[PDB]
Design a protein around this ligand. Sequence first.
Ligand SMILES: Nc1nc2c(ncn2[C@@H]2O[C@H](COP(=O)(O)OP(=O)(O)OP(=O)(O)O)[C@@H](O)[C@H]2O)c(=O)[nH]1
Ligand SMILES: Nc1nc2c(ncn2[C@@H]2O[C@H](COP(=O)(O)OP(=O)(O)O)[C@@H](O)[C@H]2O)c(=O)[nH]1
Ligand SMILES: [Mg+2]
Lengths: 427, 440
Amino acid sequence: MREIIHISTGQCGNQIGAAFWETICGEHGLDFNGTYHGHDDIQKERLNVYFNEASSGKWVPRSINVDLEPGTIDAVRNSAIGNLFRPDNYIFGQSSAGNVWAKGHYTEGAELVDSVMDVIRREAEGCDSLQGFQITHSLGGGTGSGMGTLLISKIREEFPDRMMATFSVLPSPKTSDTVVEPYNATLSVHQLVEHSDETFCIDNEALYDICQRTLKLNQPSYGDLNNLVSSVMSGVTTSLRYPGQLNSDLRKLAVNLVPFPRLHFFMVGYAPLTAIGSQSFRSLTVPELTQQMFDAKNMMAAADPRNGRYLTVAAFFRGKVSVKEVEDEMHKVQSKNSDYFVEWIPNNVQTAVCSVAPQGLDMAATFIANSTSIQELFKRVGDQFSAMFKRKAFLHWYTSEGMDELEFSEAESNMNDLVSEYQQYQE
Amino acid sequence: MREVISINVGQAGCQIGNACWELYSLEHGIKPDGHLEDGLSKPKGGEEGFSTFFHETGYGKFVPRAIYVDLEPNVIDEVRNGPYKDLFHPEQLISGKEDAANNYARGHYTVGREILGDVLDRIRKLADQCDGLQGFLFTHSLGGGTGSGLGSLLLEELSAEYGKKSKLEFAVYPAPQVSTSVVEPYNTVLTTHTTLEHADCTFMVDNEAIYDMCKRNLDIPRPSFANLNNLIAQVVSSVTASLRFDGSLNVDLNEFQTNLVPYPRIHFPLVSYSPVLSKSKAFHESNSVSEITNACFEPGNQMVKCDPRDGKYMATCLLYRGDVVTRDVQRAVEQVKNKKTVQLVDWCPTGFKIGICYEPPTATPNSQLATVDRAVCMLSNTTSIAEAWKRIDRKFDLMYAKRAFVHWYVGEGMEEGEFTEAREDLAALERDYIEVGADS
Ligand SMILES: Nc1nc2c(ncn2[C@@H]2O[C@H](COP(=O)(O)OP(=O)(O)OP(=O)(O)O)[C@@H](O)[C@H]2O)c(=O)[nH]1
Ligand SMILES: Nc1nc2c(ncn2[C@@H]2O[C@H](COP(=O)(O)OP(=O)(O)O)[C@@H](O)[C@H]2O)c(=O)[nH]1
Ligand SMILES: [Mg+2]
């Protein structure tokens, strides 16, 4: 379908969400005050993908921002980007989650769960074109991993046939913001794969590299990192937002990008990376994008895929791009680098030409695939999950809520099984 | 016989159909709005044909008897916002809503069945308007399941509905070396069963082969589906040519059943087409039908990724358009037989259906293929064909062995036994198809 709800949760969800709508509104042109600026058919016949034609032609997106920290929304509705969101969608309350996966929903967070379902239910009725639910949060974040994970299960009961897209941000196994980041991530996957259908891997540490290597940025910031993720979220939708020679869809992804059920983790990869200053000495062409998409340095997951093995890649070129420009370049990668692609697929390529182009560039393309090296990202969380809590440290905070030690052990056994799924299915 | 109804299913099918209708209106002097313009001669719009493709209007706004079927609104919207908006009755543009994705379990069933009631009644009303109704002409893809699976159901329904009209089916196949969809072997193989048992004559087109021709014969640096489809449209228009225009040797649509189909099965002719000349060359070029005829056997003009030289000759058809002498094409054929390529099997012993249509070829402004005063369309049941089946069957095998993607079909109305049976029928065809050539 076309009408899709973009749910937001967690301290990072609203941040990435603010930059998300900032880019979506720039494509078809839409002022933050809700004024129409499309030119014209392509920027008018596909405006209901996220907005609604309210009174006086005032367009407002469909997003339910939820968080237990009222101090976060204050820095959005007050400053720029605020008139778009409707005040009735704001659902916030005191105090907070406490940077823990238990209290985030198992106790305190269970109070607002009844209010979030009420707003999402009413919007679902009026929207005669529901398809899925786009969620953006952190895998180890407090309100993101706790209240965000439980929300996926509630929506799964009332919307089983509907899809469920998530943009979780994996932790950094080197520069962690909080010591209780890996622990909260072990419990989020316990219910994520048991409800959601597709989840993208994002790592902030992997962004600082491309920001200083390609973009040539010395001091990145959260305001800039969200732009990179916004380009990915806005890329897997152009087919549904604008016509093209081969319009893909979120459903077509799982039918191809997901071989077997127990495998929802993807590896994003936007391209080309516009280098500040060094963008004029380049030639935007398809052969140049293929060399950057498959580059292990541009991964945002970002385990080295060369060490592992690809499964089903996918590209979404934009702008002035033909059909053979991709089928040829993408096919050459299947020969010289055949050792990295498995044979039982067998075709390891998937295209989806669009029509329009992103603002500021003449052509763009993303990269999404399932590499066998994703298991490495889970081993880092599994080792820290057990090596740190081997002596029962920082565990009384979670057991005091009500969860028993048995509940935390089952979460580790599931992750250990996922690592084996990538060997059956030999690497 | 007289009438023919066109059916487009899925995006690729619709895109190709667009090209065909553009082309047909060009040939008959019909403007983008219909009406008329003028419509005209002998037999431009008509005199008969039309009506053959276009429905007569008491105003002159002629209406293409075409039905567009899709599950994705976007494709049809393109059509509805295109320059040919006025060539279609709006109620012939059967827009869907929720896609079947990719797809067959939904396409031939859980989603597709929800619009067929409308589709079939559309057809029935149209068919009642028609006289004779010699056949239906399907245009679709065997890649995505809407074109494959939905198209399949619709085909079946018309064989049940009538079962006596000619069922043509122009099907686009996956290139053996490259494709845009991972589960395509399932979406293709799962329908070989039904096209086998419900189409009377299928055509197999490979995009890759055509792209080769575009890059090489037409000198195209950057091919496009628009160009590719224009080529296909021209091929389709010739099938067909003598059902609209005057010809020395007129070919009935049923003619192909009589000439190309020796057994109930085997109905999968290859197409080839020439002259394919870029505008830059059509000055140096100037030739006889004997040379054009040679080009038709040349692998470079096959529009299908297989080796006709490997295969043996079963019945074939050479349709000619424009300024063509019947003696000369007989001479040309004789010379071709003497090449001893596509060894003529004893079973024919020769079987060259010659069709001679007086109407010169034409190209729309969207094609850079030069217009010519004569052209040739070739059809053939040459035994090279089973290799295409083998290719896709190996892809099917690897996947199915691990199952993997089977999940997406079984989980929504299917059974693994169905996948097994589809494979078995395909395998059976490879065998039978080989045996009738293998014997001599
Ligand atoms: N010649 C030609 N081939 C096309 C065209 N469009 C698509 N194809 C080919 O047909 C197949 C694509 O089918 P899709 O567009 O994915 O699907 P569909 O058959 O329209 O139906 P769905 O899967 O339900 O969308 C591929 O093998 C393409 O290479 C076209 O305009 N011309
Ligand atoms: N890319 C990105 N990551 C963020 C942003 N904000 C927090 N993060 C990441 O999210 C993790 C922290 O979780 P947090 O969002 O504070 O959790 P919550 O707010 O309690 O749900 C860290 O790994 C951060 O790098 C952001 O705006 N962009
Ligand atoms: Mg389609």
